């Protein structure tokens, strides 16, 4: 249940936002503000359910949409080689 980045992934906070770099492939990705917030809270050890609760309490988003959006982001992070399965 623990969200983990792949070992070769580095993170930077920049003026464009949060960036993830794959040190093997050289691919690097920009996360928008919501994606960065989700990833940061998952890396803190919070569950996706925790993060959904946070998003609904802080943003104009329904709980159902928050859960789907978190799940889609995590799936995309795994798809694109940033997060471990």
């Amino acid at each position: 249940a623990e969200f983990r980045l792949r070992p070769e992934i580095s993170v930077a906070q920049t003026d464009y936002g949060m960036v993830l770099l794959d040190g093997r492939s050289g691919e690097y990705w920009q996360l928008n503000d919501t994606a960065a917030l989700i990833v940061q809270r998952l890396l803190d050890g919070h569950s996706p359910a925790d993060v959904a609760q946070f998003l609904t309490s802080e943003y104009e988003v329904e709980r159902t949409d928050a859960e789907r959006d978190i799940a889609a982001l995590v799936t995309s992070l795994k798809e694109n080689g940033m997060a471990l399965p």
Partner: peptide
Amino acid sequence: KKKYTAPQLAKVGEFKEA
């Protein structure tokens, strides 16, 4: 509450040898 923008991930580029 804050305006919600759905999470987005964008590939910026690929670092290679020069």
